From a paper:
Plexins constitute a large family of semaphorin receptors that mediate the repulsive chemotactic response necessary for axon guidance in the developing nervous system. There are four classes of Plexins (A, B, C, and D). Their architecture is conserved across the family with a large extracellular region including the ligand binding sema domain, a single transmembrane spanning helix, and an intracellular region that transduces signals to a number of downstream pathways. Plexins are transmembrane receptors distinguished by their ability to interact directly with small GTPases of the Ras and Rho family through their intracellular region. They consist of two domains, the GTPase activating protein (GAP) domain, first identified by sequence similarity to RasGAP, and the RhoGTPase binding domain (RBD).
Rac1 was rendered constitutively active by introducing a Gln61Leu mutation in addition to loading with the non-hydrolyzable GTP analogue GppNHp. We have determined the crystal structure of Plexin-B1Δ1 in complex with Rac1* to a resolution of 3.2 Å and refined it to a crystallographic R-factor of 20.7% (Rfree = 23.8%). The overall structures of Plexin-B1Δ1 and Rac1* in the complex are very similar to their apo-structures with rmsd values of 1.5 Å and 0.6 Å, respectively. However, there is some flexibility between the Plexin-B1 GAP and the RBD with the RBD being rotated by ∼6° compared to the apo-structure. Rac1* binds exclusively to the RBD and does not form any contacts with the GAP domain. The interface between Rac1* and the Plexin-B1 RBD covers a buried surface area of 707 Å2 and is dominated by hydrophobic interactions. Plexin-B1 residues Trp1807Plex, Leu1815Plex, Thr1823Plex, and Tyr1839Plex form a continuous hydrophobic patch that is complemented by Rac1 residues Phe37Rac, Val36Rac, Leu67Rac, and Leu70Rac. The hydrophobic interaction between Plexin-B1Δ1 and Rac1* is extended by two potential hydrogen bonds formed between the sidechain of Asp38Rac and the backbone amides of Val1811Plex and Ala1812Plex. For the one-to-one complex, Rac1* is positioned distant from the Ras binding site on the Plexin-B1Δ1 molecule.
Residue numbers in the entry:
A (entry chain X): 1560 to 1757, 1764 to 1854, 1880 to 2129
B (entry chain A): 1 to 178
The structure:
């Protein structure tokens, strides 16, 4: 098994910095004419130098976060814009993070400190996610990528061993009770002799119940084994060509003249439909150009919602949540057992203490211990949550939920469903809440009931063993941060990031100007006049 | 150059595969293996014009009925084959082959081909049919079927001897031209 499709730092960062964009918003043309091009670029250049002022930047973020119009979406976006702009100055970026974290600790000490860093609704929260991502890229590439890819390929291999409905998405092998194919459909495995006419034959293990598209997907995974998704061609551009005897010439598809149509239903064409036998030569050739569809089980569209009773409380548990029948639970528990080796390996690597712990993890956990100490927080559970809502529930969980942040792969609805159960188990391992179990309890808790206590002990010993080792100084950390800045060549969209940052300055100009004029040190530094010069240069 | 698509349809073991091998390689196969969807190619001159004739062999088995219409799109000429000795294959033209071809291609010409011409006059073949109470298909019997199915031309040929075989594919190209 040679070839792990790791994303290049640029793609890794862009996907993590802008999760709700599909494509980085920083990769576009300014939209400013060539006449205003020298004057605007000079103004943006002066803004980059103004961002290096700690007093300015801190007052800039604080002013924005006090505004009603500046939403959570804005807060996360602005944090990513500052990350790209200050990627070359990671030592300074961390100093800004530290300052903003101290402001956050102070706020939460006077309210409930167990609620700190729970979500991503502030600038400092998103900055921490980006900070962790930057430092941990090598760690993910060097140590966490191997078990994570093993789990991904592991699920893909096991799910492929049984039927999957192309329409509903229901599979024979899954971890979610809602995605389980309750009816056991008639299926037989077939080993196809695959050819790539874009040549030598490659054996591909498929099932007679697979649709032409499902067969094509399984074919491409073997014909492009150690090939990333970007290098792989589009499936719509390729046709499935079945060939027998001396010359075949027959094109198979999901919908054609051969399709089974009875009433308002249309069955999708399978390999069993065309009567394709085991050992049949199937090639991939390029494409040269009402009635409801179904595949294995007909979709059950029920007009289920009735009008509720007056006094009735309904509840999303106890009555609606019927205990999973042993027949279906055994099928889910069998699936859990198959992926156990991969799950255990992944959680062991993430929470490894005998293996070297990244300095970023050590340093930030030492900072959280120091922040709790300065504010008199002795409650260990509060400190546990703080560390949990920095790094496992901020970084790790998202990487498990979505492998597309780290790898260049495609993810099916059932693949996402299985990974979610695994990710929820990882969340329960870091959570301090004790669950008794029973009936309406979540699927992940029922499946990983025998493993969660051991995982909880792994997280407990992870924070403890990190604490016992010599504290990490700023001098020790900013050395790694300096080399992290030098290691990356550039072209992340810093020029466009400065333009997008000015749009927020233009939006809240009068508000920012007051913060820069109310402060005595800011008046002596002339930060207000500096911001005016940039505002005049752009417009 | 003008390429012509040709699809050969008919009942199980009538002689479709044999008819195509005997015309392309000029040799009879002998060994019986039921074909699924074989393809053959031969360049033949008809009326002083070059033609790259594309031959498509189909399965005669009712089990392979599902995959059969995939050969039908963009076809120039059809060849409905029936055994001259087997009267069941002749009856299957009206009941199975003719309505199937017209359902997918209603404007494509059809030529009725009477396979196994050498076995029609053979003494040993008639004795086997006499005991089964069946009579071989004569020329006016087959011609009446070709008129009923709206076929452009009716030809009788034998793959083993090559009699009429060269004319079958020659008249096939002629139907496309007009
Ligand atoms: N004497 C004689 N025998 C023939 C002739 N044509 C076919 N046969 C014999 O009859 C059998 C059928 O041959 P075949 O071409 O495979 O018929 P087919 O219709 O293509 N089979 P399928 O329907 O499964 O595609 C073979 O045993 C063959 O040797 C013929 O013209 N003369
Ligand atoms: Mg045949």
């Amino acid at each position: 098994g040679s070839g792990i499709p790791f994303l290049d730092y640029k793609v890794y960062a862009e996907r993590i910095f802008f999760p709700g964009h599909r494509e980085s918003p920083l990769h576009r043309d300014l939209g400013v004419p060539e006449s205003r091009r020298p004057t605007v670029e000079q103004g943006l250049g002066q803004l980059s130098n103004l961002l290096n002022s700690k007093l300015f930047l801190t007052k800039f973020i604080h002013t924005l976060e006090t505004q009603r119009t500046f939403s959570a979406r804005d807060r996360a976006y602005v944090a990513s814009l500052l990350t790209v702009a200050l990627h070359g100055k990671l030592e300074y970026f961390t100093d800004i993070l530290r300052t903003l974290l101290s402001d956050l600790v102070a706020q939460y000490v006077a309210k409930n400190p167990k609620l700190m860093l729970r979500r991503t609704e502030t600038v400092v929260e998103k900055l921490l996610t980006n900070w962790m991502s930057i430092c941990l890229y090598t760690f993910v590439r060097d140590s966490v990528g191997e078990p994570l890819y093993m789990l991904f390929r592991g699920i893909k291999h096991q799910v492929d061993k049984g039927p999957v409905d192309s329409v509903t998405g229901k599979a024979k092998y899954t971890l979610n009770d809602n995605r389980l194919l309750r009816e056991d459909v008639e299926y037989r495995p077939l080993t196809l002799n695959a050819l790539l006419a874009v040549a030598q034959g490659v054996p591909v293990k498929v099932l007679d119940c697979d649709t032409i598209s499902q067969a094509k997907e399984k074919m491409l995974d073997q014909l492009y084994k150690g090939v990333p998704l970007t290098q792989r061609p589009d499936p719509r551009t390729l046709d499935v060509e079945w060939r027998s005897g001396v010359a075949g010439h027959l094109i198979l598809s999901d919908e054609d003249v051969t399709s089974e149509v009875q009433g308002l239903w249309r069955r999708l064409n399978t390999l069993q439909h065309y009567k394709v036998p085991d050992g049949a030569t199937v090639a991939l050739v390029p494409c040269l150009t009402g009635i409801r569809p179904w595949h294995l089980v007909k979709p059950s569209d029920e007009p289920e919602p009735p009008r509720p009773r007056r006094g009735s409380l309904r509840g999303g548990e106890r009555e609606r949540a019927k205990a999973i029948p042993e027949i279906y639970l055994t099928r889910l528990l069998s699936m859990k057992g198959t992926l156990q080796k991969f799950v255990d390996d992944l959680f062991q690597v993430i929470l490894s203490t005998s293996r070297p712990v990244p300095l970023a993890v050590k340093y930030f956990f030492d900072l959280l211990d120091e922040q709790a100490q300065q504010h008199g927080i002795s409650d260990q559970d509060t400190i546990h949550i703080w560390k949990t809502n920095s790094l496992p529930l901020r970084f790790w969980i998202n990487i498990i939920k979505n492998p597309q942040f780290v790898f260049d792969v495609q993810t099916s609805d059932n693949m996402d469903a299985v990974l979610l159960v695994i990710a929820q188990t990882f969340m329960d391992a870091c959570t301090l809440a004790d669950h008794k179990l029973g009936r309406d309890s979540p699927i992940n808790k029922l499946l990983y009931a025998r493993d969660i206590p051991r995982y909880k002990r792994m997280v407990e010993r992870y924070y403890a063993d990190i604490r016992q080792t010599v504290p990490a100084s700023d001098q020790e950390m900013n050395s790694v941060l300096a080399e992290l800045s030098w290691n990356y060549s550039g072209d992340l969209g810093a020029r466009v990031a400065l333009h997008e940052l000015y749009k927020y300055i233009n939006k809240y100009y009068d508000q920012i100007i007051t913060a820069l004029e109310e402060d005595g040190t800011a008046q002596k530094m002339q930060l207000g006049y500096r911001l005016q010069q940039i505002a005049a240069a752009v417009e | 150059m003008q390429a012509i698509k040709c699809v050969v349809v008919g009942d199980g073991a009538v002689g479709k595969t044999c008819l195509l091998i005997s015309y392309t390689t000029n040799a009879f196969p002998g060994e019986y293996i039921p074909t699924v969807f074989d393809n053959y190619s031969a360049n033949v001159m008809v009326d002083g014009k070059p033609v790259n004739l594309g031959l498509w062999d189909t399965a005669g088995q009712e089990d392979y009925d599902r995959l059969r219409p995939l050969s039908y799109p963009q076809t120039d000429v059809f060849l409905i084959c029936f055994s001259l000795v087997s009267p069941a294959s002749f009856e299957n033209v009206r009941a199975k082959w003719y309505p199937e071809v017209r359902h997918h291609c209603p404007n494509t010409p059809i030529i009725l081909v009477g396979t196994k011409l050498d076995l029609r006059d053979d003494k040993d073949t008639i004795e086997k049919l006499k005991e089964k109470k069946l009579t071989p298909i004569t020329y006016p019997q087959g011609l009446a079927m070709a008129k009923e199915i709206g076929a452009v031309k009716y030809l009788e040929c034998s793959a083993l001897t090559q009699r009429g075989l060269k004319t079958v594919f020659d008249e096939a190209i002629r139907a496309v031209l007009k």
